[PDB]
Amino acid sequence: IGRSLLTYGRRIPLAEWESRIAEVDASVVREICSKYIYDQCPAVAGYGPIEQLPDYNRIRSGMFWLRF
Amino acid sequence: PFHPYYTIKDILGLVLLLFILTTLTLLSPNLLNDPDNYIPADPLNTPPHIKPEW
Ligand SMILES: CCCCCCCCCCCCCCCCCC(=O)OC[C@H](COP(=O)([O-])OCC(O)COP(=O)([O-])OC[C@@H](COC(=O)CCCCCCCCCCCCCCCCC)OC(=O)CCCCCCCCCCCCCCCCC)OC(=O)CCCCCCCCCCCCCCCCC
Ligand SMILES: CCCCCCCC/C=C\CCCCCCCC(=O)OC[C@H](COP(=O)(O)OCCN)OC(=O)CCCCCCC/C=C/CCCCCCCC
């Protein structure tokens, strides 16, 4: 209740969440994942024995496919 | 890692070498050339001035 009234201005009932969930389909997932993930620059953090953590260019090039 | 850093670096080097090679081939082909090798061979006479390839 508290978090919702601060963030949304209103309590969202479980029924509305269910109606929102029911609309997703594979096409929606494809679209929105592409809208936020595909060919984007990431933020990376590492701590430990991280010699083998790939170079930043190698990580950036992993955000897209050449066969697409 | 070698890729991508030195891959693109060596490609740049190759582009430069090709520029030089083309200019030598087309714009000034006779720069290093020797006239005495445009005379066919004569087993009886050595020319007065002898000079190998540079
Ligand atoms: C000579 C001078 C030498 C000295 C020079 C000195 C200086 C040198 C300095 C530079 C040195 C550089 C060193 C090399 C660095 C390599 C880096 C590297 O590998 O990074 C790995 C890099 C890093 O990613 P990763 O972390 O490993 O992640 C892997 C993931 O899977 C990533 O997944 P992904 O989806 O992002 O990428 C995967 C996909 C990404 O690629 C693609 O999906 C396509 C890419 C663009 C299109 C290319 C299509 C080519 C198709 C073949 C040719 C036909 C063209 C059409 C004409 C048809 C004619 C009938 O690539 C592949 O799966 C590999 C093969 C792609 C081509 C498919 C064909 C395979 C058979 C090839 C032989 C065919 C022969 C017969 C041809 C027909 C009859 C004539 O990932 C790669 O896998 C890179 C792929 C690189 C592929 C290069 C292909 C070159 C060969 C082309 C064909 C040649 C024959 C042509 C014959 C004549 C007909 C045209
Ligand atoms: C002949 C005189 C020419 C003179 C002009 C200059 C010549 C030299 C120019 C540079 C040539 C470079 C050749 C080597 C490939 C270099 C590739 C490069 O730098 O890009 C890297 C990049 C790798 O991708 P990453 O982002 O690291 O990984 C993504 C993973 N998700 O390379 C690629 O794009 C790999 C995919 C294949 C690309 C195409 C390869 C070349 C062939 C394509 C044409 C096919 C037909 C060839 C016909 C030849 C004649 C019969």
Automatic annotation (TrEMBL), chain B:
Bilayer-crossing regions: 11-32
Subcellular location: Mitochondrion inner membrane
Domain of life assignment: Eukaryota
Entry function: Component of the ubiquinol-cytochrome c reductase complex (complex III or cytochrome b-c1 complex) that is part of the mitochondrial respiratory chain. The b-c1 complex mediates electron transfer from ubiquinol to cytochrome c. Contributes to the generation of a proton gradient across the mitochondrial membrane that is then used for ATP synthesis.
Quaternary structure (record): The cytochrome bc1 complex contains 11 subunits: 3 respiratory subunits (MT-CYB, CYC1 and UQCRFS1), 2 core proteins (UQCRC1 and UQCRC2) and 6 low-molecular weight proteins (UQCRH/QCR6, UQCRB/QCR7, UQCRQ/QCR8, UQCR10/QCR9, UQCR11/QCR10 and a cleavage product of UQCRFS1). This cytochrome bc1 complex then forms a dimer.
Family: Belongs to the cytochrome b family.
Name the UniProt record assigns to this protein: Cytochrome b
Protein source organism: Chlorocebus sabaeus
Name of encoding gene: cytb
